Design a protein around this nucleic acid. Structure first.
Ligand SMILES: [Mg+2]
Ligand SMILES: [Mg+2]
Ligand SMILES: [Mg+2]
Ligand SMILES: [Mg+2]
Ligand SMILES: [Mg+2]
Ligand SMILES: [Mg+2]
Ligand SMILES: [Mg+2]
Ligand SMILES: [Mg+2]
Ligand SMILES: [Mg+2]
Ligand SMILES: [Mg+2]
Ligand SMILES: [Mg+2]
Ligand SMILES: [Mg+2]
Ligand SMILES: [Mg+2]
Ligand SMILES: [Mg+2]
Ligand SMILES: [Mg+2]
Ligand SMILES: [Mg+2]
Ligand SMILES: [Mg+2]
Lengths: 151, 98, 61, 114, 127, 79
RNA sequence: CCGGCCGGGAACUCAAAGGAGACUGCCAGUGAUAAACUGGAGGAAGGUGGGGAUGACGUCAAGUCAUCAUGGCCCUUACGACCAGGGCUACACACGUGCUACAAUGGCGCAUACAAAGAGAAGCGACCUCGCGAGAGCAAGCGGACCUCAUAAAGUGCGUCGUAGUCCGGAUUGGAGUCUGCAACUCGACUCCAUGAAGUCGGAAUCGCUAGUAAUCGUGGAUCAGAAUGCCACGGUGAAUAC
């Protein structure tokens, strides 16, 4: 907005696992307003990732999200002239949501078998740092530190 | 036994008609279950407003058909037949049935 | 068919409901008509806003 | 094999295999398979030849392939020669069932042209 | 003894009858687990009788009508929340912090004139 | 093909069929009724069908069974 | 006959009449001590709670002489009146608003869930019989919380397809049918069999939406003998982001 402060309530924690981040991930991954399909797909991918990596269930995806989160983002700014890519500081929640969106879109663009396996593959290659989410992730880091004096 | 239904458009006029019916029925006899609210019909209409073009200009109207039900199982007939024909029902629709 | 019974169409083809248009009653408009009040959009509203039609009220559900 | 046809529906399920043949749809294929008393999920090619013979005989009972093609084509030229209103639209090329030719009639007229 | 709670959410009226004993949940004269509980309100119906006490402490009989999956889920949750008068209202102090006592007044918004659903305004050409 | 289970024919047009058959083909008969159905009772006959301004003659044949009288009357004019 | 169906009762859902409640009201802090602002408590609902109706003085010689009325002008052996057919449905192109798709968060088969709001007397039309079908015969009940339209679809439980112009996609087209109506050819709707184009996410450019919102899934109503992807209207699932 422009005058009134806003803030959204907190979605319910993810069923059984109780992961608020996982509940937010199903929100982002949701399509056409169908939580059942999103929940089934996320659980299938989560168990596949856990059994493939030999890691636990809760933090197996936490590692990938930690390793695919950025630090600064370029904001199109033009005070006197044309557009300047001015990098800025990323808020905590904004960083988390941006990494989550990156993972979801990276899984979207794949074609391996189906969402259940594509999400697991994205998580694995994000843990390893050889995926496409990470490939897009390093771009902001390389484009940072361009124009500081401007604001 | 004898079930009576009253229809009108106003909510308080039907209430006073039902009050008159029940008061006369209890005076002349007994065994009155009182009026029953039952659903109320909401006939909804919408009409274009401008006499030419201007499709967006519309007006919404609604008619509230209120309905009341009251039944009596009085044994004696000389009370019900006397109750009939003496009541104007506050000038709204009313029906007699068994 | 059964014999020439169908051919008995010598009627002026006016009694058939298809011939009647069911226009308005005060002025007469082919369009903007409703069965309930038997008038047409415009006229209806005039009556409702003037308070002629019983039980008609603005809808604000 | 061609199964009283020309197409070789290999490594494919029964109903789809017979659907791949001209002049036969899903319902007609269901009729053929049920009459032949063959399972539906079993592949046509993986099946034994004793049943392919019965399928040949069963399929030969309906008008299909070039026979049906010529039958339907002959009707077109016939309604063209009759001079019917429904037929003289074919010679020009445009909707004949009564669609609107002003727009959304490009499927039968082909891509646009100035 | 018997204890009653109404429960409502999106024109989804419930009826919850809590009582002592160590029985199971019953919704619509039938088991919730039989009625697809593992995804239908998998952990919505059994919210209120988790935080304050254990599930296997009070028998109950629920029956809800009208609504959908989440409609029934929320209606039963609200009814149970307002059906835990086992000992005074000391538990409502804790349930207030969790926010389960208040219902969800949010409802489907009517369809306006000149719009498609409620706020989908038909697109216009040029400006 | 469609339209119930039986054909329809006009009566003041059905008055001309019997005369035409009894007296043989003499000349096409001018009429307006674009409703009658080519029934076998017409091989070897010519009928003039109205289109609005002029009555176009048309000769009936053997393979016009499911085709109506007004069918062979082009009302759309093109360049 | 273990079906709320039958004795009964009215607690409860619910239905419809009347009331209570929310008013910055009680506290803390900020503020020229005032208005007011921030926060907390209580409370189902905290700050005109959500939504609708409600549209100031005026502008655009904005729209309607065609809804109707009306000043002036004109026709009145025709610019009036009756009828058949035709036309408003044309079609080398362009634009606007929509529907259906390009598929695996899917398609198909079996099973199986959970809703609201409406109409019904030349009308809604159970059940039963015939038909692969649109439908036909019989035809109770219902001027209505009773009967009918009317077994909501998404959803979930199993099996199949395994990434292709395909079991996606349905236009076009041929044959055969159902049904309203004096009348389905110009020019209607629906059904059965067959064929199965384009289309594999879309340039410049541009549109809506901040919470039950958007997104997507069904149902109804008016006009109406027979007609919706349009208009009006009800509900299910249900987000992301506002520095
Ligand atoms: Mg008509
Ligand atoms: Mg006049
Ligand atoms: Mg519009
Ligand atoms: Mg909706
Ligand atoms: Mg407060
Ligand atoms: Mg006001
Ligand atoms: Mg002007
Ligand atoms: Mg003008
Ligand atoms: Mg005429
Ligand atoms: Mg027109
Ligand atoms: Mg048409
Ligand atoms: Mg399909
Ligand atoms: Mg109707
Ligand atoms: Mg009703
Ligand atoms: Mg077909
Ligand atoms: Mg493809
Ligand atoms: Mg109709």
């Amino acid at each position: 907005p422009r005058r009134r402060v806003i803030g959204q309530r907190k979605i319910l924690p993810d069923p059984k696992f109780g992961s608020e981040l996982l509940a937010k991930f199903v929100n982002i991954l949701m399509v056409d307003g169908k939580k059942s399909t999103a929940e089934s797909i996320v659980y299938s991918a989560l168990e596949t990732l856990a059994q493939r990596s030999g890691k636990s269930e809760l933090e197996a995806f936490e590692v990938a999200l930690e390793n695919v989160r950025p630090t600064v983002e370029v904001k199109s700014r033009r005070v006197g002239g044309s557009t300047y890519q001015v990098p800025v500081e990323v808020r905590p929640v904004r960083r988390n949501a941006l990494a989550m969106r990156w993972i979801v879109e990276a899984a979207r663009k794949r074609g391996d078998k189906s969402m259940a396996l594509r999400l697991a593959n994205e998580l694995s290659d994000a843990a390893e740092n050889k995926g496409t989410a990470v490939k897009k992730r390093e771009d902001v880091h390389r484009m940072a530190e361009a124009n500081k004096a401007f604001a | 036994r004898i079930r009576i239904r009253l229809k009108a458009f106003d909510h308080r006029l039907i209430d006073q008609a039902t009050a008159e019916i029940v008061e006369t029925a209890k005076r002349t006899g007994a065994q009155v279950r009182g009026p029953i609210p039952l659903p109320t019909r909401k006939e909804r209409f919408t009409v274009l407003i401008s006499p030419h073009v201007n499709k967006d200009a519309r007006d919404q109207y609604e008619i509230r058909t209120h309905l009341r039900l009251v039944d009596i199982v009085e044994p004696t007939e000389k009370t019900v037949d006397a109750l009939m024909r003496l009541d104007l029902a506050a000038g709204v629709d009313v029906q007699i049935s068994l | 068919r059964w014999n020439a019974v169908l051919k008995l169409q010598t009627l002026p083809r006016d009694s058939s409901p298809s011939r009647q248009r069911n226009r308005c009653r005060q002025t007469g408009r082919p369009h903007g008509f409703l069965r309930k009040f038997g008038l047409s959009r415009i006229k209806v509203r005039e009556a409702a806003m003037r308070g002629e039609i019983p039980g008609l009220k603005k809808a604000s559900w | 094999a061609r199964i009283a046809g020309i197409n070789i529906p290999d490594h494919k399920h029964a109903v789809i295999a017979l659907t791949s043949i001209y002049g036969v749809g899903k319902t007609r294929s269901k009729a053929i398979l049920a009459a032949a008393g063959i399972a539906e999920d079993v592949k046509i090619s993986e099946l034994s030849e004793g049943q392919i013979d019965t399928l040949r005989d069963e399929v030969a009972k309906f008008v299909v392939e070039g026979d049906l093609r010529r039958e339907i084509s002959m009707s077109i030229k016939r309604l063209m020669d009759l001079g019917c209103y429904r037929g003289l639209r074919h010679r020009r090329g445009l909707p004949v069932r009564g669609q609107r030719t002003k727009t959304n009639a490009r499927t039968r007229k082909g891509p646009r042209k100035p | 003894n018997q204890y009653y709670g109404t429960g409502r959410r999106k024109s989804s009226a419930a009826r919850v009858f809590i009582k002592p004993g160590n029985g199971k949940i019953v919704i619509n004269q039938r088991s919730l687990e039989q009625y697809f509980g593992r995804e239908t309100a998998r952990m919505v119906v059994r919210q209120p009788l988790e935080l304050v006490d254990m599930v296997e402490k009070l028998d109950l009989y629920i029956t809800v009508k009208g609504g959908g999956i989440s409609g029934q889920a929320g209606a039963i949750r609200h009814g149970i929340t307002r059906a835990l008068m086992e000992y005074d209202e000391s538990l409502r102090s804790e349930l207030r912090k969790a926010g389960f006592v208040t219902r969800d007044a949010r409802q489907v918004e009517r369809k306006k004139v000149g719009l498609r659903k409620a706020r989908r305004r038909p697109q216009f050409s040029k400006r | 093909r469609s339209l119930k289970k039986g054909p329809f024919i006009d009566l003041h047009l059905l008055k001309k069929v019997e005369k035409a058959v009894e007296s043989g083909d003499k000349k096409p008969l001018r009429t307006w009724s674009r409703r009658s159905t080519i029934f076998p009772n017409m091989i070897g006959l010519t009928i003039a069908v109205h289109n609005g301004r002029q009555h176009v003659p048309v000769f009936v044949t053997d393979e016009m069974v499911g085709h109506k009288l007004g069918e062979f009357a082009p009302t759309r004019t093109y360049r």
